[PDB]
Amino acid sequence: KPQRTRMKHGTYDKLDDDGLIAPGVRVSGEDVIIGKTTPSKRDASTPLRSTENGIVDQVLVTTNQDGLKFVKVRVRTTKIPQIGDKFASRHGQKGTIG
Amino acid sequence: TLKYICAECSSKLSLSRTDAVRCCGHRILLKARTKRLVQFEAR
């Protein structure tokens, strides 16, 4: 978790100090999902996809066959049928909910 | 508790930046849920 010593707009508020949010945390908008730094410090963190939100589902920490500590954050969202969503019978006509 | 569950063997664990990323000796680790406690609207 970096703190201005060029970061991104959405808050870094939700990350733990290892740099990662943790399952259960509700994210949205632009929130920093992954907190990454390059050496004072140029900021290289991963924001959440702008048009989204949900809750963090699993976070996995591991390594590639040599070296790299890497990280994968799964984010859950539920999607309720809604005006403009697409639906089709099994006969090749889609439509959306009007 | 602390920080990381383990992919297999389910061992609760915590280390930084000692040791390197391991366990069992499995190299896949999961972050535990926050104690933050989430609210749902049940809608």
Add this chain to the structure above:
Amino acid sequence: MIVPVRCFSCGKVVGDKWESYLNLLQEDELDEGTALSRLGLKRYCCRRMILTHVDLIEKFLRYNP
């Protein structure tokens, strides 16, 4: 994943019917149409709920963790 609580189209409680419907099939050795009528699921909206339910929870439960 599991029995829905209510029938989508009318809201009958249906999530209390799944174990009995399994029982009606295997141990009373009945067919599905009669099974569902014995459970008072007359409206075909409700029938659809149990008749087409697919109980994948039973597979998810087989994961280790």
Add this chain to the structure above:
Amino acid sequence: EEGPQVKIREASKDNVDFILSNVDLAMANSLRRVMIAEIPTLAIDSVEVETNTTVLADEFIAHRLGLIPLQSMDIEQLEYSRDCFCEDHCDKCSVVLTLQAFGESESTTNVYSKDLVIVSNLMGRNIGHPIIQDKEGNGVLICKLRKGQELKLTCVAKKGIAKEHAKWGPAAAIEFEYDPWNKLKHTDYWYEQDSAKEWPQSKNCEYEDPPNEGDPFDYKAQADTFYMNVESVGSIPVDQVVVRGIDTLQKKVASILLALTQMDQ
């Protein structure tokens, strides 16, 4: 008591099958709509998940909880949380329930609405108790647990209506029919050969005279007799669904009178 006549044919703890008569179609309908849409009822409106270790998502479960019908017999005695002068929820306007389950067997563990536990103070209003209707007293299957898996949770039940979310609707379906013989010619029967043959007569053809063929179309006759059947989901006794159906409608119209009254003052 001159006015809308009621009969009755079946009645049980779940269905009341009645004939409405001496009423204009609109009123039979508005009462039909209300019973579906506007009768206040109790239902889980908030889940706080302490630990979930099941194979389901929290909101998946939360969704199901809100669908468990709760005892709503004394709901007028419960306040709308939004009107309650308490900070968020309290005993004046909400019921708090608990769910704790652990799977402590090789065998697979089931979680039912019977496992919910009222933890708030009910002031002796009959309200909040999860509705149970099956032979073994289990109610709804909420979840299923493997050995070692866990679910700990707190829900707040709140007063609401179907309009806001269908989990609040006391009623299952409402069968509605009039003019089983088509005297009034409100419908126009599609056919290949003969509409008479291809269309099955409804139940209610027994309870009415078939028209005699040597006859002018009756042009004054109106929809005044209605064959209804109300099915209660358990959260209120049926007789109530109808009764309170009528009530809420009264409160609604009366409330329009208070507004006309209020634009003199």
Add this chain to the structure above:
Amino acid sequence: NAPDRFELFLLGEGESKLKIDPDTKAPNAVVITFEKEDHTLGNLIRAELLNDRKVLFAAYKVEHPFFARFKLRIQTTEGYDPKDALKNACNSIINKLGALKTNFETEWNLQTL
């Protein structure tokens, strides 16, 4: 982008239940905007207005399914205030439901469960 669903039944702020406007194109007519109501009151109140003989016009409409409001137009014969017709249509309704509740309650107690 969806509104809160409580907006189908919950008023305001800034909003009152009834707006009465004095029409324009016809003598003695009125147009009432009912807020946070739908076809349940609409069709009802109108249907009853139509049993009034001193009513030469009654009609309602939901202009768009998204918002919960309806417009209701009452024209009446001279010397008869539409606001009073609405009153009377209401009272007339309040009764008939009373009558009905009671009748139903009566028939209920007859039943063997």
